Design an enzyme around this catalytic site. Sequence first.
Site, PDB file in Angstrom:
ATOM      1  CD  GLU A  35       1.379   0.300   1.840  1.00  0.00           C
ATOM      2  OE1 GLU A  35       1.901  -0.466   2.671  1.00  0.00           O
ATOM      3  OE2 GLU A  35       0.165   0.589   1.915  1.00  0.00           O
ATOM      4  CG  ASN A  46       0.432  -8.446   6.858  1.00  0.00           C
ATOM      5  OD1 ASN A  46       0.326  -8.908   5.729  1.00  0.00           O
ATOM      6  ND2 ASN A  46       0.976  -7.274   7.088  1.00  0.00           N
ATOM      7  CG  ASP A  48      -3.212 -12.183   8.190  1.00  0.00           C
ATOM      8  OD1 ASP A  48      -1.983 -12.032   7.959  1.00  0.00           O
ATOM      9  OD2 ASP A  48      -4.070 -11.994   7.297  1.00  0.00           O
ATOM     10  CB  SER A  50      -0.695 -12.700   4.916  1.00  0.00           C
ATOM     11  OG  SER A  50      -0.989 -11.421   5.421  1.00  0.00           O
ATOM     12  CG  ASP A  52       1.796  -6.572   3.681  1.00  0.00           C
ATOM     13  OD1 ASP A  52       0.881  -7.395   3.363  1.00  0.00           O
ATOM     14  OD2 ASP A  52       1.707  -5.769   4.633  1.00  0.00           O
ATOM     15  CG  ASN A  59      -1.448  -9.619   2.516  1.00  0.00           C
ATOM     16  OD1 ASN A  59      -2.432 -10.378   2.526  1.00  0.00           O
ATOM     17  ND2 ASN A  59      -0.576  -9.551   3.520  1.00  0.00           N
ATOM     18  CG  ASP A 101     -10.510  -6.711  -5.307  1.00  0.00           C
ATOM     19  OD1 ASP A 101     -10.680  -7.752  -5.987  1.00  0.00           O
ATOM     20  OD2 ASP A 101     -10.771  -6.632  -4.060  1.00  0.00           O
TER      21      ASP A 101
END
Length: 129
Positions: A35, A46, A48, A50, A52, A59, A101
């Site tokens: 990562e 990202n 979209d 967003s 990280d 994110n 989650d």
Amino acid sequence: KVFGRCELAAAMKRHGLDNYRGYSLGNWVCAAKFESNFNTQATNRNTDGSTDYGILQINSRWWCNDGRTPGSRNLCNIPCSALLSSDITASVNCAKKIVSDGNGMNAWVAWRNRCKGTDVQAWIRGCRL
Ligand SMILES: [Cl-]
Ligand SMILES: [Cl-]
Ligand SMILES: [Cl-]
Ligand SMILES: [Cl-]
Ligand SMILES: [Cl-]
Ligand SMILES: [Cl-]
Ligand SMILES: [Cl-]
Ligand SMILES: [Cl-]
Ligand code: NA
Ligand code: NA
Ligand code: NA
């Protein structure tokens, strides 16, 4: 801060991540490696829009607030900047919520693609823990 391999293993253990939701310490170290390359200040935009953040590339769509991610949530109740700290507490606390989650460590696509099913114990090999 750029952690050492065994150094990060030790901090993850200290913060109760070893076997959290059944994922051995090697898993967490392997995820952090791919990562962020162990660098707490890592950030990656990202497609979209967003972002990280940090050693575990958490994110801003779901997990932290950065002030620039439309329609997003802040489920860890933290500014995404807290995830860039040399102290890994915020990242560890938020990664605990993520891995709870429902999809376990599959939430980290790099974990699924590069760590899952591998000899992750190698990541903590030789560490005094
Ligand atoms: Cl390494
Ligand atoms: Cl392990
Ligand atoms: Cl911006
Ligand atoms: Cl936002
Ligand atoms: Cl929220
Ligand atoms: Cl905030
Ligand atoms: Cl720390
Ligand atoms: Cl699981
Ligand atoms: Na945000
Ligand atoms: Na957000
Ligand atoms: Na916004």
